[PDB]
From a paper:
Formin proteins direct the nucleation and assembly of linear actin filaments in a variety of cellular processes using their conserved formin homology 2 (FH2) domain. Diaphanous-related formins (DRFs) are effectors of Rho-family GTPases, and in the absence of Rho activation they are maintained in an inactive state by intramolecular interactions between their regulatory N-terminal region and a C-terminal segment referred to as the DAD domain. Biochemically, the FH2 domain potently nucleates new, unbranched actin filaments and remains attached to the growing barbed end of the filament as additional actin subunits are incorporated. The mammalian DRF Dia1 is important for stress fiber assembly and cell migration.
We crystallized and determined the structure of an “N+C” complex containing the N-terminal DID and DD domains (DID-DD) bound to the C-terminal FH2-DAD construct. We obtained crystals of the DID-DD protein in complex with FH2-DAD in space group P21 and determined the structure by molecular replacement using available structures of the mDia1 N-terminus and truncated FH2 domain as search models. The structure was refined to a crystallographic R-value of 23.7% (Rfree = 29.6%) using data extending to 3.2 Å resolution. The crystals contain two dimeric N+C complexes in the asymmetric unit, where each of these dimers is in turn composed of a dimeric N-terminal fragment bound to a dimeric C-terminal fragment via interactions of their respective DID and DAD domains. As we discuss more fully below, we cannot unambiguously determine the pairing of C-terminal FH2 domain fragments into dimers. The tetramer has approximate 222 point symmetry, and is composed of two symmetrically interlocked N+C dimers, as illustrated in Figure 1B. The tetramer effectively consists of four layers; two FH2 dimers form the two central layers, while the N-terminal dimers pack on either side to form the two outer layers. This interlocked structure is held together primarily, if not entirely, by the interactions of the DID domains of each N-terminal dimer with the DAD domains emanating from the more distal FH2 dimer. An ∼85 Å long α-helix (αT) extends from the post of the FH2 domain, and the autoregulatory DAD domain segment is connected to the end of helix αT by a 10-residue loop segment. In the present structure, all four flexible linkers are disordered, complicating assignment of the connectivity of the FH2 domain dimers. The DAD is composed of a core helical region with the sequence motif “MDXLLXL” and an adjacent basic segment with the sequence “RRKR” in mDia1. The interactions of the DAD domain with the DID are essentially the same as previously described for structures containing the isolated DAD segment, but additional interactions are observed for the basic C-terminal portion of the DAD. In the tetramer, the FH2 domains pack back-to-back, with their actin binding surfaces facing outward (up on one FH2 domain and down on the other in the orientation presented here).
Residue numbers in the entry:
A (entry chain E), B (entry chain H): 745 to 806, 828 to 1198
C (entry chain D): 134 to 452
D (entry chain A): 134 to 194, 197 to 452
The structure:
Amino acid sequence: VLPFGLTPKKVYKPEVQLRRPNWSKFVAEDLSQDCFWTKVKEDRFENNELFAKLTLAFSAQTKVKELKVLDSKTAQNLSIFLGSFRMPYQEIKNVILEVNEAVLTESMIQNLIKQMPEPEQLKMLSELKEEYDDLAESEQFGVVMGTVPRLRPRLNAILFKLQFSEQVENIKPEIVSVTAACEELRKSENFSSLLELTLLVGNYMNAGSRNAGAFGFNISFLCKLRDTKSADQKMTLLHFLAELCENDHPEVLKFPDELAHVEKASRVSAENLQKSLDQMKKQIADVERDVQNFPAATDEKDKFVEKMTSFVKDAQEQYNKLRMMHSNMETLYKELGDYFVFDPKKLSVEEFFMDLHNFRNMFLQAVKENQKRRETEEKMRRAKLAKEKAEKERLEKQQKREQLIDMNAEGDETGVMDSLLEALQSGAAFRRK
Amino acid sequence: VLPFGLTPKKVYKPEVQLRRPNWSKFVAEDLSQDCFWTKVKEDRFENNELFAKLTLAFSAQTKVKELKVLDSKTAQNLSIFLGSFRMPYQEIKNVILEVNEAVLTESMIQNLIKQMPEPEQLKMLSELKEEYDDLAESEQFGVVMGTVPRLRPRLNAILFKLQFSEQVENIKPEIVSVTAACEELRKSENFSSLLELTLLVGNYMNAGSRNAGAFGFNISFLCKLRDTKSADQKMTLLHFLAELCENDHPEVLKFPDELAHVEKASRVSAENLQKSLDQMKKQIADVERDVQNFPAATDEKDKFVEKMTSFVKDAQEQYNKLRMMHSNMETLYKELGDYFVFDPKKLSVEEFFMDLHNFRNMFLQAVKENQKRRETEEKMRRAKLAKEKAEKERLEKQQKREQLIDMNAEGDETGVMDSLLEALQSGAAFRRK
Amino acid sequence: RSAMMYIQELRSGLRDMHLLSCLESLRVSLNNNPVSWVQTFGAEGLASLLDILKRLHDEKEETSGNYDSRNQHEIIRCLKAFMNNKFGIKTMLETEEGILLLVRAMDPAVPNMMIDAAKLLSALCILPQPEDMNERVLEAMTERAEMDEVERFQPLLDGLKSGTSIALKVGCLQLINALITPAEELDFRVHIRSELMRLGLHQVLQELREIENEDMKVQLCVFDEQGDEDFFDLKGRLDDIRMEMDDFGEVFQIILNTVKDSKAEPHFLSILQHLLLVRNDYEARPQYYKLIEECVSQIVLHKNGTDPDFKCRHLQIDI
Amino acid sequence: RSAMMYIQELRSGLRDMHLLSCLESLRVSLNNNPVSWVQTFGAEGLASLLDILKRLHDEKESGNYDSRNQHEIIRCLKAFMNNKFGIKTMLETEEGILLLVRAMDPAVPNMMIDAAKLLSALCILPQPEDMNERVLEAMTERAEMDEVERFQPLLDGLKSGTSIALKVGCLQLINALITPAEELDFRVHIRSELMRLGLHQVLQELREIENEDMKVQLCVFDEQGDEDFFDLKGRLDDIRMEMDDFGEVFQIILNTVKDSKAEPHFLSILQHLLLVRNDYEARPQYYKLIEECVSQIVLHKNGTDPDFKCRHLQIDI
């Protein structure tokens, strides 16, 4: 009760509740006689009708039925899931057995899988089929789904189907990108010529030691070219080679354009394509086993054995095209290994086409570094010529004015002025250039 | 030897030894039949005098006297030292004893301390005086320096002397900075006006919470103001406060200018100042005590005791003026600690002023951001009005032209064309507005 | 009544004088008869008129003397009487060549037909519905110019030239106005008026201000009016630029964006380079930029709403 | 010899025709004795000549006949400076060049002729450094104590009423000030100042005169302005080579214009450049004509600024 020589700050009662600064406050007696916060029993020195304006900006406004089988985990989750689905239970069943393509989506099926109670609890629900009306919403769904033969397998096959064409478009482009790059890098004789040019230049520098008269080098080393530079440290081997091409062999400058797909292949995971095709083959073999172990379609609506056999034929067809390309792709890589001499087993395809992609970009960068640097030379050579020429002309003009009068030291005679005035008159003092 | 199906690559003999790439080379029997490096026996495919342009860019071109006392290290160090210093050994001694300010440098004394043999050796060399001529270069220096009394302390004192007027100019500027910002913060009523303003806004926002009726808040929280923003995340509390000072209290916006030495204070060191002065105080009393134990000058050249008595009176005269400024500065910070109520011992000087500096910049930031947002509101209001202007006038033109042909559900009239040309040819059919 | 038979008379392929006496009585019908009569004539009889018109147009295998261009003028009078009502207007516009053939009808060589033909197009131009009417008329004139290998306004210019008649001089300037005044966007009105000046309108216009004809002064005064509007609007667009673009870096970017990859790029660079020569005198350098500015403002913000002549040289300054 | 006698005569305070008779015979002595004799008169004797002149130039009231006295001093000065000592000795006085400048009164032609003739000879000297700038510096000094244009005297000596020989001597000095100067900006700066004062309409009248000495001077003034144009043409090529990047050039223009009255105008130019109407074919031609106009304004031939009072411009092909 009562603070150190002052009155409590007015208690406010706002209309709208506001966002606030959660600061460490100072209550009454954290203050001393001569401190700043005692002087501010003002609180009026800055009063307006801004509370309206402040409130506007910082407002923070806006039994029946019992459970006989299922645990309250699943019987609650289904209550929500079925709340969003709104589809008659006797229709969902029919759409599952028919595999109605127009109604079914990848999203829809994926929810059912997740939301379904395990086969143990479906069985215990299909022994209570008669007493259908007394059951809760969640369990009513189950009693319907319990009469669907081998649900868990049936639903898995449907998913893989609706997901099949989508995952072919995950493998294919990337199989092509690595196929293209392997064939572009094999076709490029401009690339070829760079190597020949590099070898020669290298073979000469290697003088008379360890390497010298070498028949080749590893394609990997291509990025390391930039690592050899002049003694003055002004420029690199890459640069020199690039400049040698620029002047003497302009054809070589076109090799970055001949390796079109090389970037796309730098990004493709080699290990993930292997895993993908191994998974696709597995998923095929799964539906294959499911089809063989399926009961006789004991109602007119069960189209499962019919439509899935039509899918295994097709899914295997597209897969064998896919595999062909992959094994083809891998061949063309091993082909490159044998051709440019490098171990294809120690460098994965991404890894190899990354080193290549990087080099491309180093070469193109070295090419503009050669232009920019050469542009600096021609301007600076023209600027100093124009300044030599300006200075030469300037001196010539100076001397022509100095041939008038020897302000030096020679014997005093009385021409001088009468000699200057004559040159002014005739124009001899104002020599041109 | 005759290689694997092809002929050897020519041996070059270079003039200048060049810089070479160190690639993993391929020799003859590394290749295969159909590989790339066999086809490139084409070393002729590219051949110029570039071999001469390459060698250009990448060339890489350009008794007596025995020891008796010193160890192999020290004697060697002195041999390189004394073949560079070139000053006579009798002269070196004389420069030290006199403390000759025209000869001595900071650079010169420092090198003496490092290159000097240590007391034990100097003592062991001082007993070989008579055979000075038979000694080696380094040991000659040794015997001569041996006769100088208390050399280690004598040199330590000379160094600190030549170094004194430097460290004065390291402590002072930093002292002044903090002294000023402290005075700058205390004097500015515009910053004071913001805190008042912030607390008022602050107290209303805290509604009926754990805060509200606060007599203040810690000054560090100033950077935390930005953290509280509007519902629409488009404007913050700091942006509000800037704009409220921009409109209703323009005086406020002058404080970032009132706080000129705050930046320079944000970069000082609280501890290192104390360190520096405490290292100076000890160093004054080092020489003071070294001037008391010194033996009386036994030649006309020993000017130590005379000259260093002039220094200690002079150095303590300057230290005490610094010690004044420092404890005064600390007082001023203790003063700010109480005025703005914050623990001066649990928040260092640099700590405080960095927070203050950060907030200073945050505030201008908010002001710039506000003029920028507001300009985008003015150039979007007028722009939409310049569009509502044209659209109204565009419909006004249409409503004038349609007053000749009515398109909704007409009857009959063969005039029309006669009514068109009666105005077209008479000029009325070209309105003004 | 008798309209269905006029259609048969046209398609039996009447020639020379027999056709003209048919068309002359058809015109008499289409004027004096009611609205209802022309609708049952409608699209059928109209597309016949336009096919006989198209036929007579492709009889141009001889100049310096024609035998049947008297037939052509009668069709134009028929088309006028036809379009005298709201249905005919609507029906005319729906034809694929109704307007185009009215444009091929415009010939300075034979005055009277062009007066009537350019009067119909001038009426179509000032039409509310449908949308961009004057622009269709322009398209026809362009289409005509393509097949002839001539400039699209050339006949309109040839008709204005002092050798012809007073009714044609007005009739051509009327269509000039009728093409320009209904058009709403500025860059178009100017774009066309500039095409008229390049073809040499300004020379001709200063001859027509001598003539003391009233129906002529009306068209000059309207033309002059619409030309002043354009200047005023350009001056207002200058004010909007002055108030929206006030940052150097922003303005320079905009120009750069507008100029990039065109033939104006080399010139803009050269303007900036030349600006680096404005002598380094404290006092002369502003006067340099002011005069430069002053010149430019006369080039760009040019009087009467036309491009400066790009084949000539000369410029004055205020007030 | 008798040199000290003259100094004692000059410092004695002679007047009217007495002062004249003495100076007359001093001019004779100066022009006829050896160089030896001039040196003994020397700095002392020149100083008094200049003192007498400084007294005479202070004239407050038809006119003074002592223009004979003033002109006669100028004549001694020519004789005195007719040998290498006299020149170097005159260049050392604080008020020598200035007093000559003050003796350029178009209202007494023949004196101005002789005075402007000396000032011209000083201008085209190799040593010391920038002689022309000193002569110009003095013309400015005289112009401020009179509150006139520093080139008014010169222009007045060129106007149509004046003698043909005054006209030559005048334009002679003009060339003496422009020609030796090395920096392009400075030459153009001075020439543009002459035109500003009204040199252009005058030169028109001056070309029609068939006087040999005159024709020579106009040739030089033409030549010296034709040079400047070439150097400017040259300067422009240097620019066209170095400044090939849009961003860089634009930065330089801002850097030179920033914080000068020239700034608003540059924005105004650019704002207009937005206005060039949006049409595929008409736009590049606007930018060409704009470029044409800016080319004419900047690279003005004759080595002069454009007349900023001139309100009409032709912008050819």
